[PDB]
């Protein structure tokens, strides 16, 4: 019964995002019948997320459109989470409430 | 002190290194070469060694397009270079070549 915490939150959110996509789509997409690209679809997920962090338009030449609309959906969600977190942290630092060594550098990188 | 002329050995080793490691890791590739830094390796890739770069004579259309654009946006080479599909240094040299041979 470990309890979510600041150390574990980013890891937690991405953990349950990988699970969210995995359960949803592999219970949603299927008929591969053997194993359908779970490792691979998730690698497409991390690839897309990096691409959006680098602001590089990400277009895979072949791909099923439900898979693509999938990735674009969840990626936009994680983008909304990350961005909102960034705004909020800059508000906290602006008011000078939080003194942390990491959140300042991270928050900087984000902006 | 590190700066200097590019060598066929350094350039081929740069080909192989870029092939193996990938485009986004420059510090790793600069580690193998001597007398060259990471910035220099990257800009040396994207400026010249990159196979997507077009090395050949300019057709008539490319000269029309280059001249027109250069009269449209004076002195901006990094904006024009992607539009004609050539390297900024290359289209520069070719432009001074067009004014040089034009008179």
């Amino acid at each position: 019964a470990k309890t979510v915490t600041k150390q574990r939150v980013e890891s937690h959110f991405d953990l349950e995002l990988r699970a969210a996509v995995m359960h949803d789509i592999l219970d949603m997409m299927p008929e591969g019948i053997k194993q359908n690209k779970a490792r691979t679809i998730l690698q497409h997920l991390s690839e897309a997320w990096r691409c959006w962090k680098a602001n590089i338009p990400w277009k895979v030449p072949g791909l099923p459109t439900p898979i693509e609309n999938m990735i674009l959906r969840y990626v936009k969600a994680k983008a909304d989470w990350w961005t909102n977190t960034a705004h909020y942290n800059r508000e906290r630092i602006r008011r000078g409430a939080t003194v942390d060594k990491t959140v300042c550098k991270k928050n900087l990188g984000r902006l | 002190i590190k700066g200097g002329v590019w060598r066929n050995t350094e350039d081929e080793i740069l080909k192989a290194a870029v092939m193996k490691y990938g485009k986004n890791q420059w510090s790793r590739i600069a580690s193998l070469l001597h007398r060259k830094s990471a910035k220099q390796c990257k800009a040396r890739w994207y400026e010249w060694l990159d196979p997507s770069i077009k090395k050949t004579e300019w057709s008539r259309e490319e000269e029309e397009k280059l001249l027109h654009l250069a009269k449209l946006m004076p002195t901006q080479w990094r904006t024009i270079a992607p539009i004609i599909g050539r390297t900024a240094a290359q289209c520069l040299e070719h432009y001074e070549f067009l004014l040089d041979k034009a008179a």
Partner: peptide, 27 residues
């Protein structure tokens, strides 16, 4: 065949307006 998935081999792990002409020639 449709559900062939391109391997996600990882890489980690342009047009112009004609108004520029009117402006530049104007100046």
């Amino acid at each position: 065949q449709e559900w062939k998935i391109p391997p996600c081999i990882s890489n980690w792990k342009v047009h112009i307006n004609e108004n520029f002409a009117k402006l530049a020639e104007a100046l």
